[PDB]
């Protein structure tokens, strides 16, 4: 007590306190070795215990920021590895931490993490703490904005894959499909929490609260506006702190909110009963990803209050954030069939139909049909989702991914080929995740997951800005980002890329690659086709990539793969310019 450091240490416990302070330090210094962070973890941790014992020991009075920040300025070769971070060390808090966050790196391009079941199981055995703590470090620097408490959860069950399939008979066919499943849920968690951190950075806490109201209202329609307002206030603080690097306060404020949600579960949702009977970290996760509660029979008509009342302009002018807050709570809770972005688009439209109407002579007759200005906003997303699932169901993940790589390469021919491939592929996964779902939960799954995919494209675009069309879609409006991108067409001020034969030249190296890595090189080539002939129809490119695949399939199954690529490759590179006029 009387010390911020000692206090968390006490409540969170050493294991987690360390766990979070390692993740925190990994995210900030992505370049440093694993053992250089352990000693910063152990030096800080030592200080927590020393402060815990004696709360008037030197500098124990200082803030987490000053402590974590002072410890980030004592590391080896900070100027050599991170010349940018050195300058941050000159400034004091909070100026320093903001500077620190500035130089976080969203695409550091480190080796992809490979399941190596021989060694990893062996390292887990000599030191389990080390092998698992090394997994915290690894994902923490590849995802500088991951949800630290949610990582400790992913790191407690990465261990429960090695408690199962380390002593077992088959060391890969027990382990790989679970470490490959962990990875697809890592990539999803990171995306969700990058979109929360991105929302603060570009749009603010008003935007993150509005999103939360919509989402939580949909999940907890039984809860009243005071419960939702409270959980949103609390959940927002949890995310603001996690995104700014206060992973200690983030883990305590999140556990307090779990404690609360669970104490009040009968008033909030009947779905929570399952989540609240579980251990600490399992509780927070089960709540974060919980099924939506059944729509309540006693849901009120909104016509009366939001369209029919004659003193709405008074309600609205007297306190707007509140009245609009209430609207969003009410419309969201009765529309779980809707996407968060769509609900916020509708809230933004409801708002604009009062700002205008309340200046006209008779407002009530102006906003009486406000609700039928929502129908058009609902049709558009529902079309695209049916348009995209009808194509997906017909041609599969690969051909759908290929179709989207052409769509987005035409809208943004200046974005790099890896970025276009990753986004097209990330978007292609959407069809796999949402189209098979009950069509009831199809529009929400599709749009909410397009929001994660587009947000990454924006994160990358901040780092490496190439296109003014992509800037406007990423920065103007959070609600309208997907509609903004959907609306983009081919940039006709684009100069088609000077044809380089080496780009469309394949060799036998590709025949060794796993299926996934083989597609990326083919999809990489597709993007480069669209760049060279932007006007080429999607039907021309699908045919020319077909000719490329056939060509790869054949030569990979030749006695002389090397000679086959040598003879056929050039013939195909030349015939493809003429197929794409
Ligand atoms: Co406490
Ligand atoms: Co900020
Ligand atoms: Co702070
Ligand atoms: Co309705
Ligand atoms: Co990349």
Numbering used by the authors: 3 to 583
Quote the passages of the study that discuss this structure, keeping the authors' original sentences.
HSA is the most abundant protein in plasma (ca. 600–700 μM) and is the main carrier for Co2+ when present in the circulation. HSA is also capable of binding non-esterified fatty acids (NEFAs),15 hormones and drugs, as well as a variety of other metal ions, including Zn2+, Ca2+, Cd2+, Cu2+, Mg2+, Mn2+ and Ni2+.16,17 Based on spectroscopic studies and affinity measurements, three Co2+-binding sites have been proposed to exist in HSA and other mammalian albumins: (1) the amino terminal Cu- and Ni-binding (ATCUN) motif (also called the N-terminal binding site or NTS). HSA and ESA are composed of 585 and 583 amino acids, respectively, and share 76.1% sequence identity. In general, the structures of ESA and HSA are highly similar; both are composed of three homologous domains that form a “heart” shape, have 17 conserved disulfide bonds and possess a single free thiol group at Cys34.19,35,36 We also unequivocally identify the major Co2+-binding sites on HSA using site-directed mutagenesis and examine the effects of NEFA binding (palmitate) on Co2+-binding to both wild-type HSA and mutated HSA forms.
In the case of ESA, a total of seven structures from crystals soaked with CoCl2 solutions at resolutions of 2.3–2.8 Å were determined and examined (data not shown for six crystal structures). The presence of cobalt in the ESA crystals was confirmed by fluorescence spectra with the excitation energy at 12 664 eV (0.979 Å) using HKL-3000, which showed characteristic peaks for cobalt. The crystals of HSA in complex with Co2+ belong to the C2 space group, while the ESA crystal structure presented belongs to the P61 space group. For ESA, anomalous peaks were observed for each of the five sites in at least three (out of seven) structures. The strength of the anomalous peaks ranged from 3.0 to 6.3 RMSD (3.0–4.7 RMSD in the structure presented). The only cobalt-bound side-chain common to all four structures is His9, proposed to be a ligand in site B. Residues from adjacent protein chains, which could potentially influence binding in the crystal are also indicated. In NEFA-free ESA, additionally Glu251 coordinates in outer-sphere mode, forming a hydrogen bond with one of the Co2+-bound water molecules. Of the sites without histidine engagement, two are formed by a single aspartate (XII and XIV), three are formed by a single glutamate (XIII, XV and XVI), and one is formed by one alanine and one glutamate (XIV). It is worth noting that His109 in ESA (V) is not conserved in HSA, where the corresponding residue is an asparagine. Of eight of these sites involving histidine residues, six are formed by a single histidine (V, VI, VIII, IX, X and XI), one is formed by a single histidine and a single glutamate (VII), and one involves the backbone amide nitrogens of His3 and Ala2 and a glutamate (IV).
